[PDB]
Amino acid sequence: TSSLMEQILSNDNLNRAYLQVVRNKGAEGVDGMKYTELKEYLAKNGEIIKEQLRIRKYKPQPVRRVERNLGVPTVTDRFIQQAIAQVLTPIYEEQFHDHSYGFRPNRCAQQAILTALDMMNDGNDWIVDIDLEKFFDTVNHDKLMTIIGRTIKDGDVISIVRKYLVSGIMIDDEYEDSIVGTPQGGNLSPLLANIMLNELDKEMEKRGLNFVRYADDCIIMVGSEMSANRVMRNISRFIEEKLGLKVNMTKSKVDRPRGIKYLGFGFYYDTSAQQFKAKPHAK
Amino acid sequence: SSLMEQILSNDNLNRAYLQVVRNKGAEGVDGMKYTELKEYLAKNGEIIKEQLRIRKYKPQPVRRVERNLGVPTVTDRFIQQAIAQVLTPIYEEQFHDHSYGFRPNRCAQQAILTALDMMNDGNDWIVDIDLEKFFDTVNHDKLMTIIGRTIKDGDVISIVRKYLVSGIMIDDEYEDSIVGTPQGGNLSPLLANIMLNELDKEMEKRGLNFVRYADDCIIMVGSEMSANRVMRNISRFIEEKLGLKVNMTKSKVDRPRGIKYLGFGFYYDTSAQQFKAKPHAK
Ligand SMILES: [K+]
Ligand SMILES: [K+]
Numbered sequence: 339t340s341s342l343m344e345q346i347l348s349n350d351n352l353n354r355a356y357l358q359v360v361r362n363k364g365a366e367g368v369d370g371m372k373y374t375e376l377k378e379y380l381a382k383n384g385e386i387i388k389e390q391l392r393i394r395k396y397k398p399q400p401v402r403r404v405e406r407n408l409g410v411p412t413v414t415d416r417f418i419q420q421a422i423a424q425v426l427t428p429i430y431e432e433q434f435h436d437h438s439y440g441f442r443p444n445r446c447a448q449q450a451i452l453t454a455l456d457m458m459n460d461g462n463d464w465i466v467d468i469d470l471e472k473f474f475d476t477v478n479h480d481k482l483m484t485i486i487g488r489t490i491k492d493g494d495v496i497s498i499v500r501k502y503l504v505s506g507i508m509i510d511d512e513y514e515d516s517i518v519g520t521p522q523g524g525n526l527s528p529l530l531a532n533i534m535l536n537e538l539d540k541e542m543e544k545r546g547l548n549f550v551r552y553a554d555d556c557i558i559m560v561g562s563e564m565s566a567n568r569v570m571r572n573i574s575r576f577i578e579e580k581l582g583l584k585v586n587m588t589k590s591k592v593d594r595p596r597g598i599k600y601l602g603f604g605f606y607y608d609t610s611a612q613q614f615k616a617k618p619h620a621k
Numbered sequence: 622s623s624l625m626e627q628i629l630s631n632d633n634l635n636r637a638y639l640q641v642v643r644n645k646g647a648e649g650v651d652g653m654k655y656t657e658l659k660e661y662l663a664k665n666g667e668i669i670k671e672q673l674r675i676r677k678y679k680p681q682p683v684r685r686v687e688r689n690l691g692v693p694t695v696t697d698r699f700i701q702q703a704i705a706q707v708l709t710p711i712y713e714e715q716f717h718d719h720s721y722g723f724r725p726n727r728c729a730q731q732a733i734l735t736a737l738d739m740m741n742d743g744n745d746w747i748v749d750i751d752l753e754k755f756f757d758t759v760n761h762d763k764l765m766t767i768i769g770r771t772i773k774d775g776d777v778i779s780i781v782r783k784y785l786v787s788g789i790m791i792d793d794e795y796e797d798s799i800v801g802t803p804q805g806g807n808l809s810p811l812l813a814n815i816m817l818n819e820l821d822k823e824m825e826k827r828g829l830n831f832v833r834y835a836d837d838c839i840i841m842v843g844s845e846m847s848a849n850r851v852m853r854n855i856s857r858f859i860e861e862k863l864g865l866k867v868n869m870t871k872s873k874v875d876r877p878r879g880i881k882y883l884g885f886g887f888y889y890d891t892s893a894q895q896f897k898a899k900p901h902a903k
Contacts, residue, residue: 361738361741361742363741363893363894363895364893364894364895365892365893365894408892446728446730446731446734447730448728448729448730448731448800449730452728452800452801455801455802456643459643459645515899516900517897517898517899518730518733518734518737518885518898518899519734519737519890519893519896519897519898520737520741522893602900608801610647610690610804611645611646611647611802612645612655613646613801614801615799615800615801616799616801617797617798617799618798
């Protein structure tokens with residue numbers, strides 16, 4: 339991974355990124371450029387942008403704050419972000435935990451719900467529901483880049499990824515309202531969050547915990563109230579002390595499935611089926 | 622090494638019994654609880670196996686439960702699961718990538734995502750064909766003939782036909798956006814997918830953009846005239862070639878806002894400038 343920048347800038351990869359970003363549509367960024375204008379802009383500026391990226395002179399624009407609050411990158415920056423993610427995603431898909439489901443290829447929120455239901459119906463129906471503050475509002479950039487740097491050795495890729503953090507990329511959280519569809523502004527930021535939170539997945543696996551995670555939204559299924567309180571404390575301590583993220587103490591809770599709201603779903607006991615099932619909760 | 626001996630193998634039966642216990646569920650007509658299956662098979666498994674080998678095993682009728690469900694006895698769920706475990710890998714290689722219902726590693730949300738991608742590519746006239754319940758209308762001989770193209774083991778054909786007669790069908794709680802283990806669906810959804818795969822191949826040959834979840838399919842077309850023509854042609858194929866029943870008053874052509882599919886409604890996100898989906902009011 340010492341020379342990933344030229345893979346990112348290859349003609350095939352950039353053309354795939356352009357196609358995907360146009361397919362994703364979305365609102366315009368701070369430059370007012372519509373997604374239908376990207377093609378003509380890159381015909382004139384694509385080679386200049388490649389040369390700027392090669393010497394770390396490309397300057398991402400700040401995201402446009404759009405009001406749910408969204409940070410929308412310019413369509414040029416979504417294109418570059420997508421080009422970066424197309425190369426890093428296969429690298430990290432080999433590392434990620436099978437119970438991580440958010441913003442990953444061939445995975446979705448319903449899969450996370452099904453796995454959690456299997457866990458609850460096996461007897462692990464004490465739920466540790468840890469609530470985290472917004473990832474990109476709180477993550478330490480140096481800590482994140484150090485974690486990424488364990489795998490990515492290409493300093494040019496490290497450099498532009500850091501610049502996109504400063505630009506304000508963030509996670510579109512409409513999945514919390516059970517919305518299905520293409521997120522806005524999420525070509526790169528959800529991958530970066532998964533890289534950091536993959537350290538949490540590894541810790542929970544090391545502890546033998548049953549969990550599902552969707553971006554920064556995790557639930558842990560344990561067998562007793564005493565064990566649930568112990569896990570709530572230990573994992574909350576780990577997240578704040580080792581990952582430097584922030585736990586919402588009042589919103590985090592231990593409960594039975596009936597009290598959990600997760601990825602827009604609630605849980606209930608089906609007395610005919612004699613097991614827990616899930617359905618969208620009232621909103 | 623026949624299909625039936627594969628179904629009755631020790632590894633296959635043990636996996637089937639474990640999965641059926643894991644699936645829990647209500648009792649069938651014999652009153653046997655899922656917690657009683659282990660002891661019953663310890664005592665009677667060899668008799669059951671012998672009866673299956675010589676085509677003398679008799680499935681019990683499903684139990685009507687109330688949304689109406691037909692619940693097989695837990696022994697029959699076990700045998701159905703044992704059959705499905707061998708037939709599923711065979712048919713998984715024949716099935717279409719836009720078939721999502723009751724298949725390993727596939728779910729309703731994936732069908733929604735694929736449909737949304739087709740809609741946002743400009744195919745936002747939706748053909749919404751409504752079929753009467755598959756197992757209330759399918760002709761058993763027609764279904765078994767389609768299955769027989771692949772399954773040549775007469776002992777497997779025999780027991781599958783007997784399960785059709787017993788009344789197996791498809792738990793449709795996914796229509797209410799419910800996520801979880803269906804009741805009574807160890808074998809019936811696979812059989813429905815085997816026949817409806819004939820529709821998938823016909824739609825693929827016609828170059829149509831579609832998604833299907835069991836007997837619930839929507840087709841994404843570029844214009845109103847094209848959508849009505851597809852509705853005409855595909856409804857005719859379903860009735861004439863598959864012998865299924867199309868409900869005229871419920872089979873419509875509409876824009877995404879008028880479609881309810883797998884519990885989801887569709888709307889146009891003006892900020893994102895694209896269609897998205899979310900649970901519809903119920
Ligand atoms: K959570
Ligand atoms: K339909």
